[PDB]
């Protein structure tokens, strides 16, 4: 179950954990924590 969603343009933010780019800073913060915590959540949407 490996997803791949690439946009366009070097984002000012990058997750130094997996390797994903985020346009908004707020979003990243959420993702970061998302990593840890297994609550009926495995596969991603996009
Ligand atoms: Zn990440």
Swiss-Prot record:
Zinc finger C2H2-type: from-to: 13-35
Cell compartments where the protein resides: Nucleus
Top-level taxon of origin: Eukaryota
Function: May be involved in transcriptional regulation.
Protein family (similarity comment): Belongs to the krueppel C2H2-type zinc-finger protein family.
Protein name: Zinc finger protein 484
Native species: Homo sapiens (Human)
Lineage summary: Eukaryota, Metazoa, Chordata, Craniata, Vertebrata
Part of the intact protein present: 519 to 551 of 852
